[PDB]
Write a protein that binds this ligand. Structure first.
Ligand code: HDD
Ligand code: HDD
Ligand code: HDD
Ligand SMILES: [Ca+2]
Ligand SMILES: [Ca+2]
Ligand SMILES: [Ca+2]
Ligand SMILES: [Ca+2]
Ligand SMILES: [Ca+2]
Ligand SMILES: [Ca+2]
Ligand SMILES: [Ca+2]
Ligand SMILES: [Ca+2]
Ligand SMILES: [Ca+2]
Lengths: 678, 678, 452
């Protein structure tokens, strides 16, 4: 609907060429009924030419992702800190488009790879398009944009054989990380549950860089952007994420699309940390360094407004694939900082759209068009859609009466550089010594996780580093991890049968910070959209009756209910053959189906043991599990699940069962089921 | 109109980026007032990126050209001969766009090169876009499209040094013509005045190929398209074309522009020759052979409707440079023939737009869009401007209720191949022996020219062949010309110091045909838009009054009058310094200006002898010339122009002078001034 | 090898720009140690421009795949059945490059999706490059190339949300299969273990179409290509393939890489079925119909030679990603048939390389070059890597003494269309009634499987 002017309806009508000539497209024109195809068959060639040219280059990074439309609403008049028009009044609404993504994988790689994630937001403001091109992790691997190809070459597949897909679990990546210590902070985030979010809706967005807010009086403040999920934070566990990558490569895009269609459009508070220009080096690190967070204990979050996604695209290629974000899409009231990573991005995102679009008029694509008039002297170029009436597109002119007029701080609401900004010194290719502590903040992060969260991060490193062939690289990795934490180095080293190097306490400390832990961020604030699998049977009409009664009670509370049985019929959504524990946030067995959980059970309709394996996987991955109806022993014993376990439910009463189970869905994960290093 | 929706008005407002952010664009962002430019200057980079990417590849042929909008109006309901919708009712109006061109020259080459000319017409019909991609010469150089790169390589500049521009006057071209005898018919046309038309408005358009008119009953006839100029046929002379190339490379595009802006938009009758399928070999040649005309004595012209061009473009690049014509843009009621030159064109014009546009969505450019709904399953591609609502773009489908519907002869006004058409025989790379007479029709054409017109054609060949460096190429040319006409070969041979081969009478004949002569086509039917230069002086008030009185007389009759004097002032349009005889169709000297024609005349304000040169050039080139006043003989003596001469006017009276002079403008050229061979 | 000349060694040396100027690439040039980056930093911009432009469009189909180098060796002089030079002597070796693939998935999708698989083989022959662009299933879903976008739109992800990846398990695909009954034969194969082969080495290759072998005397026979695996045939089971998709998306490409690195390079017997022109309709179906096999009981396989893959690429992008196969890459001794699926392929594979390469000189990429001299009047175009010495590139010419000379059946070992080929009848957009049995051969295939 925001792009309704560009929609093409094909719900009626005869087939036409692109120039409106009615045609057919099902049989080639031939010299005789068993003859060769004719070159004069224009119907054939226009259709096949289009098909042959459908593809465009995937994004150089963040190739795998999914988007949606929505609205941003300001909570206040923020004039007192920024001239930004979209923030200038309480309740002011601006249309948005967001794309979420992974980083390393190509198109069609799995959503549930371990990775950094993108969170890119376009505000179609009444003073121009403004993009915040963020990630779900607030810190970046590297401190200078010129290193971006080094990082990305090292994490993408080895270039002789293009193995492995969508993974850091290979020699080159860990060679880079161990040789470039700046990488430690993002690496620890990626190896945490932040690397495998439960959904795009259960992760935050961060600008990463320090930006400026600039008032109409020319004064500036330094900001960090934080988009704080109103769904809660949640993660997968790795051994779930790996199966999910195979069972449903589309899991995150499907979760987002389904949340919007069900009227559960995800929300974020758009927030900033706001500090003075004088505080650039006040917090024990440099605000120009994109490997550092401002601990919330030093600068609290100010809520600016609400971001809500509530409308799926009409055509994925035209809207999601083609959206071309840029940090250069900036508006009056915002400015850059001298963060050398941000600085180089400004070049990269304008240039790379020439590769994707194949020509310079990419801002004319509907998804990239602003929602206000364009007045400039840009002309021509391949794919030019506009027919410009001004035949004097040069400044200064008299023959077009001096239009367009120059916009600046004092006229026409121009963008302007923060006028207090200066530079001084030598023209240098030198790194600021203020950037040199690569280890304190990774230790800050690690210290701020719960004990089983710390175990999960150690286990992710054990997983990946064990797949590194080079004994030299593994030793170098242990040298770097040891500078963050001797305990991490020892525990990782144990899995790969190397010794950790001796403790080096230069950067060790016991400081913690709020709001980085997933396991610690408490029960989810809402269970709406969470997925309940009810394992039933067609062999017992009472099992289907139990499942129907559970469905009614769970759907009332906005849970997405799947009834599973051997075969489809009224009231059954999936077969056992297509069901997997990765498709549910909790699993309920109706006790009328207990016979399908016996070690004897076999059917040509699903793989051997599938009903019990769904229950066992869900338990072993930490999910709420239980048996509804009062006869729980046969199922729980077959699964080796204790009836007294936390997040294990057994009730005759459907109402009592659902009340208990719903508390478990909010807890989301039962971390007592994971072993800890001593 | 898809054009009106994309018009952009910059007559007011502040400068913005392409995403609507107000900006400036006159000073770079620098680290200090004398400092280096910053990479974060997005204003600089988006502007210069656009500039850097303004250009697109020129067309591989017909790169130099100019276009205009207009209307086609049917004279009748032509249902009796064609199903074509745009021809189905008296007075039915269809919008058009026409581009005219040369062939060989690049962009910026001169309009008045000697060349074949394009005349490409798009009919934006209510059943799809229909293009007739024609030339001003009815026959083409070659008989199979596979040879097109051979012809074009040979006539385009030599590929080691890219010399010479926009000319056949070089060894390679005449090597190809002499080795590929099919070329003789078009070569004779290009060496006639048809190679140097006076304007786009003073030439005809030809489809060249035989096409089919197909009725809704499936029956077909064979047709040739003729667009017959209502302005009359007129040529330049070669020496005039050479000077005009230098003095005004834009002569034809300016002539067209100006005629439209003055309310003198050019007109053609869109005509066909119509013959039965049984006549394909009945006229002594094969109607599939694009080197042959149907003599009008065998098949008269039927007038179908009026083509008028009456609106100039708004943006040349967006409309004229980007228009992408295709013979594949066909509509129900028209069909192809098995002409091997037409057959391969169908492939070329779809493919080549990928090169120009850089992507497959070129039909979405406003100038290329149809005027009717588009319904098809073409998707994606770079530059996709649509948002398709049908998420099941495959046939056959049930999920989109079987839409779009297949269109064909029976349903949906589908295009259909003429159902009488067959093929039979071996799959061959063989030329039809019916194509083998390369010489009879060139001789018919030559025989049909007037004596002075024959001399101009011999003189164009003498000019060009004398610049061929290879004695052997020259001999081979004479061999080929001699098979058309011994007299042509003898006369051309005399200029290059070779002997002509002995007469070879195999293809010699004395037959003539109507309607191919320019010199024989009689006075122009209208003198509106023709240019009169009045050569005056600021010295004598009487000269300026004489000029102002002629101006009033002549402008009354729609003549574009230029008063020329030493310097500009009220009533004087042009200085002697910028004036040339190639700027005028007729030249008048006011007798008050006689002093400027003396041999001792000199001025820092114009080159020595300029005023007399303009008069003497106009006279040499055949134009109507005269002295208005009462002295008369002084100027005519200076010019050695005889007062009794045809198209030489001497009148004291402004009224007698103008009545006489305007008859000379209709006669247009006085051919008695050109010497003939003995 | 045109690849040898283009190998670039970076085992030693100082970093340079692409024009050989020694540079650094680790720190941006800034106005002071905490200052903004300068526009004059050419080191930064050349490196980042390259990075920004690394990607090219994935293949419109078969986007997910992997390749290797090897050798074809002829078992005999096959002059008695074809003029093809690569088959004209016992022991004659020809270098090859093969790419294997799925069909529907994008780049990065899993190897072990259920799908049809590509098996595309380039023979760098002494009379030109010859490609056999085949699949692991001998029959195709559709009977006319004009329907290919319909099939592919229906199997690829739904276009509002781009779900699901690399799968036919969705409404649109089964809508198309149920509305277009031609699809049944390939669908049965895709739903068999042939949809989830154990490895690229454990599957066969098929040309699918009937082609022609043409002798120097102009006579022709109808052939089918069969590449028969020496490793045997093997499949995954589905519940295994689904887990493997997640645990190792690269399983087939690693399996191939490892087998070559260990000296276990995979082998196929390159075989044909050979039948007379007069048998086009003799077997109860039409040999022009690409939904039909010739049962081996009616026509046995002749072994022509050995294909072995024994060398991994050096640079996956340069070699595997950029290899551009075409059934139009044909050599003297082979000809097309009037199979309406093959007929349209010939158009598609030449055109689509313009999308992938961005310009017309894609045959100049080292992996696409031939191993004989090129003599033609093709010129210019973006990315022109040749410096042509012939300044008269038109035929007919005298100024280059008539060179290059036309090649044909009687000159220069030219390609020639089989001279017994004819066409008769109306110019029609009509399906042959001989194509109308969509169900018997799917039944034959199903009958031929074991109960499990
Ligand atoms: C110098 C280069 C460079 C650097 C240092 C970064 N990126 Fe970037 N990024 C690109 C160069 C790039 C790119 C090559 O220009 C991409 C590819 C597609 C595109 O439009 O821009 C891109 C895409 C891209 C996308 C996908 C946008 C979409 O969905 O279409 C996100 C979310 C980010 N990046 C986020 C980041 C963040 C949070 C960074 C550090 C704080 C970051 N990038 C550093
Ligand atoms: C096999 C190739 C081939 C052959 C045999 C021809 N042409 Fe052509 N022509 C082209 C290949 C082409 C092209 C390369 O496809 C062009 C370049 C730009 C374009 O759109 O198509 C073209 C452009 C072009 C244009 C310019 C259209 C415009 O103003 O944009 C005209 C008027 C003609 N041609 C006319 C003809 C006529 C009357 C021909 C013979 C009767 C003819 N051409 C044969
Ligand atoms: C009319 C279109 C059309 C039809 C009917 C087919 N294809 Fe195709 N195929 C293409 C259009 C295409 C293409 C769009 O042109 C591709 C994409 C990439 C490329 O080079 O060609 C392609 C790629 C492609 C590849 C990948 C080559 C590589 O690894 O790079 C294989 C193996 C096949 N196809 C095999 C087949 C088989 C065995 C077919 C039927 C018997 C078939 N295709 C029908
Ligand atoms: Ca590696
Ligand atoms: Ca976690
Ligand atoms: Ca030459
Ligand atoms: Ca003339
Ligand atoms: Ca038809
Ligand atoms: Ca679907
Ligand atoms: Ca099997
Ligand atoms: Ca391009
Ligand atoms: Ca042939």
């Amino acid at each position: 609907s925001p792009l309704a002017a560009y929609e093409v309806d094909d719900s009626t009508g005869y087939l036409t060429s692109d120039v409106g000539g009615p045609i057919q497209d099902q049989t080639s024109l031939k010299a005789g009924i068993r003859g060769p195809t004719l070159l004069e068959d224009f119907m054939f060639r226009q259709k096949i030419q289009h098909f042959d040219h459908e593809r465009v280059p995937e994004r150089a990074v963040h190739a795998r992702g999914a988007g949606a439309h929505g609205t941003f609403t300001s909570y206040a008049d923020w004039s007192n800190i920024t001239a930004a028009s979209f923030l200038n009044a309480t309740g002011k609404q601006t249309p948005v488009f967001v794309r979420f993504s992974t980083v390393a994988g190509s198109r069609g790689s799995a959503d549930t790879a371990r990775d950094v994630h993108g969170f890119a937001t376009r505000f179609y403001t009444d003073e121009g398009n403004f993009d915040i091109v963020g990630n779900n992790i607030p810190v970046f691997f590297i401190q200078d944009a010129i290193q971006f190809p080094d990082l990305i070459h090292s994490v993408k597949p080895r270039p002789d054989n293009e193995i492995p897909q969508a993974a850091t679990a290979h020699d080159s990546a860990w060679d880079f990380f161990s040789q470039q210590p700046s990488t430690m902070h993002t690496l620890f985030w990626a190896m945490s549950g932040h690397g495998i979010p439960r959904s795009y809706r259960h992760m935050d967005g961060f600008g990463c860089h320090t930006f400026r807010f600039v008032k109409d009086d020319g004064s500036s403040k330094l900001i960090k952007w934080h988009f704080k999920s109103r769904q809660g934070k949640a993660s997968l566990v790795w051994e779930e994420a790996q199966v999910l990558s195979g069972k449903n490569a589309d899991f995150h895009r499907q979760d987002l699309w389904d949340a919007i269609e069900s009227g559960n459009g995800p929300e974020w508070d758009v927030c900033v940390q706001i500090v003075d220009e004088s505080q650039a080096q006040a917090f024990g690190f440099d605000l120009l360094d994109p490997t550092k967070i401002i601990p919330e204990e030093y600068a609290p979050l100010t809520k600016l407004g609400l971001l809500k996604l509530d409308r799926n695209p009409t055509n994925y290629f035209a809207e999601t694939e083609q959206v071309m974000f840029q940090p250069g899409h900036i508006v009056r009231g915002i400015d850059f900082t001298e963060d050398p990573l941000l600085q180089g991005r400004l070049f990269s995102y304008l240039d790379t759209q020439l590769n994707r679009n194949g020509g310079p008029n990419f801002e004319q694509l509907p998804i990239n068009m602003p929602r206000v008039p364009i007045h400039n002297n840009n002309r021509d170029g391949a794919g030019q859609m506009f027919i410009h009436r001004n035949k004097y597109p040069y400044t200064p002119n008299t023959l077009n009466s001096g239009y367009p007029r120059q916009a600046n701080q004092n006229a026409g609401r121009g963008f302007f550089t923060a006028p207090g900004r200066t530079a001084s010194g030598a023209l240098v290719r030198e790194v600021s010594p203020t950037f040199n502590d690569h280890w304190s903040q990774p230790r800050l992060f690690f210290n701020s996780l719960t004990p089983v969260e710390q175990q999960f991060l150690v286990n992710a490193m054990r997983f990946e580093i064990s797949l590194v062939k080079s004994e030299e690289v593994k030793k170098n990795v242990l040298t770097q991890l040891n500078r963050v934490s001797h305990d991490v180095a020892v525990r990782v080293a144990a899995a790969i049968g190397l010794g950790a190097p001796d403790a080096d306490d230069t950067y060790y400390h016991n400081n913690k910070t709020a709001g980085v832990s997933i396991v610690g961020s408490g029960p989810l604030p809402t269970i709406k959209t969470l997925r309940v699998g009810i394992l039933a049977t067609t062999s017992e009409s009472s099992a289907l009756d139990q499942a129907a009664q559970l469905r009614t009670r769970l759907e009332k509370d906005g849970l997405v209910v799947t009834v599973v049985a051997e075969t489809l019929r009224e009231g059954v959504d999936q077969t056992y053959s297509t069901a997997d524990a990765t498709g549910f946030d909790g699993v309920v067995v109706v006790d009328g189906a207990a016979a399908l959980f016996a070690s004897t059970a076999s059917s040509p309709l699903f793989p051997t043991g599938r009903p019990l394996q769904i229950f066992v996987d869900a338990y072993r991955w930490g999910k709420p599990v239980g048996v509804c109806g009062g006869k729980s022993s046969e199922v729980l014993d077959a699964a080796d699940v204790p009836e007294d376990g936390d997040g294990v439910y057994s009730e005759e009463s459907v109402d009592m069962f659902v009340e208990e189970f719903e508390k478990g869905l909010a807890t989301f994960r039962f971390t007592d089921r994971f072993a800890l290093d001593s």
